Amino acid sequence: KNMLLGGFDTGNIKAKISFLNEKGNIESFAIPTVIAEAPPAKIKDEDIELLHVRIISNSLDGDARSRAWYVGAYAKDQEDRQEPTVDEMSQKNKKLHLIPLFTSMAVAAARIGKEEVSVPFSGGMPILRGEEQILEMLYGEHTVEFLDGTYEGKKIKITINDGTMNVEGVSSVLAILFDIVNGEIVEVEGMDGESYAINDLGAGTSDNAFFEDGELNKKLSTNTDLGTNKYIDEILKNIKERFMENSPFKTREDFIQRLVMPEVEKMIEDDTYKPTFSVKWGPVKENVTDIVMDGMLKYAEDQKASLDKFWDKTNADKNIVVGGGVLFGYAGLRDLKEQDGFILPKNIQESAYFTSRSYLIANLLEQLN
Ligand SMILES: Nc1ncnc2c1ncn2[C@@H]1O[C@H](COP(=O)(O)OP(=O)(O)OP(=O)(O)O)[C@@H](O)[C@H]1O
Numbered sequence: 001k002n003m004l005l006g007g008f009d010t011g012n013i014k015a016k017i018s019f020l021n022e023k024g025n026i027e028s029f030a031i032p033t034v035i036a037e038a039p040p041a042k043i044k045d046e047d048i049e050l051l052h053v054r055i056i057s058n059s060l061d062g063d064a065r066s067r068a069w070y071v072g073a074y075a076k077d078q079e080d081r082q083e084p085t086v087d088e089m090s091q092k093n094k095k096l097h098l099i100p101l102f103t104s105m106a107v108a109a110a111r112i113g114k115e116e117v118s119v120p121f122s123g124g125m126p127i128l129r130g131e132e133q134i135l136e137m138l139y140g141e142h143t144v145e146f147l148d149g150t151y152e153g154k155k156i157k158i159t160i161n162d163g164t165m166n167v168e169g170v171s172s173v174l175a176i177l178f179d180i181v182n183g184e185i186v187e188v189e190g191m192d193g194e195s196y197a198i199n200d201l202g203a204g205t206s207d208n209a210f211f212e213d214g215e216l217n218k219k220l221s222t223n224t225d226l227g228t229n230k231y232i233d234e235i236l237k238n239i240k241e242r243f244m245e246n247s248p249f250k251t252r253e254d255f256i257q258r259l260v261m262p263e264v265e266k267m268i269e270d271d272t273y274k275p276t277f278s279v280k281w282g283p284v285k286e287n288v289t290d291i292v293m294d295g296m297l298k299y300a301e302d303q304k305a306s307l308d309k310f311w312d313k314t315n316a317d318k319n320i321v322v323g324g325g326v327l328f329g330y331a332g333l334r335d336l337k338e339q340d341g342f343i344l345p346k347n348i349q350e351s352a353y354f355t356s357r358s359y360l361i362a363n364l365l366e367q368l369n
């Protein structure tokens with residue numbers, strides 16, 4: 001069986017994928033939504049640290065049809081990198097999202113030792129492009145060749161024939177109910193109604209979706225810009241200021257990965273653990289625990305207020321809260337484990353991949369018909 005099963009959650013910060021590995025388990029990772037033009041040849045998740053790929057796809061035109069690219073983190077450093085341009089408030093972009101998408105597909109396939117994969121697509125609609133108009137941009141054959149990195153020399157044959165965009169579907173909430181451990185397993189809490197919110201707390205955006213009869217109420221459902229990133233930017237600015245009485249991190253993800261994630265992990269598995277944050281810069285090592293915690297708490301609080309305001313607007317029976325924001329502001333948001341109308345994933349560590357996980361589960365049910 002040459003099938004790669006995945007859920008694909010593409011935004012403009014990152015392209016997220018959850019897929020079944022050879023062990024039948026969910027494996028998740030994210031590729032930053034950044035590409036850059038690259039020459040025909042070369043010069044946890046280490047295999048995506050350096051992506052130089054040739055892609056051949058009819059879903060790309062002109063410059064793009066059959067050439068080489070840097071993708072993801074490796075491309076964040078290129079001078080001529082392309083990123084999504086946002087406002088002071090497809091066609092030419094489509095490659096900026098298709099290439100990281102296909103690359104994630106080629107990486108997963110490499111991860112499971114395959115080179116011919118059929119990829120039934122399981123995705124979500126963006127934020128004119130009908131469900132099977134998005135799909136038709138993905139259908140057919142695409143080849144991804146690794147010109148460098150861990151997989152140098154591998155060619156992947158990605159075939160996409162079919163797919164869903166989980167459009168009005170309740171595929172969105174599946175990751176709160178199920179896991180995949182070779183096969184579908186129910187998950188031990190939730191504490192399940194006919195009315196629930198899903199708040200996906202993200203890097204640049206908070207998705208505030210509302211469900212009645214499991215289909216999406218388009219009116220009340222909304223998408224704000226209440227991301228973590230702003231709070232993260234404030235924290236990083238204060239850290240640098242403190243070091244400026246006699247930048248420590250590259251990207252926000254570096255800040256998240258090396259400083260913040262291990263402290264949050266501990267906090268999760270032990271309710272008593274008081275976290276500490278230390279930053280090494282130059283010849284100096286500062287304790288920036290108050291700085292970091294202030295940012296998280298201000299974020300948790302702001303999100304607490306946003307969640308209540310959406311709870312009244314909908315008067316939903318249950319309010320599911322997911323996304324990376326739940327981890328970033330866990331310090332204050334764990335309080336939601338107490339309140340009645342709020343549901344946090346039990347497996348909180350997989351909170352950032354909630355939506356991709358839901359799609360992946362949705363995809364597996366489709367296969368089982
Ligand atoms: N384990 C963790 N501990 C602490 N913070 C985390 C953890 N996992 C993710 N985050 C942070 O949570 C925030 C949101 O992550 P998430 O993956 O939901 O963003 P996203 O889906 O890329 O955002 P958007 O909705 O804008 O596309 C980010 O700042 C991310 O770095």
Ligand SMILES: [Mg+2]
Nearest residue numbers: 011200202203
């Ligand atoms: Mg998101």
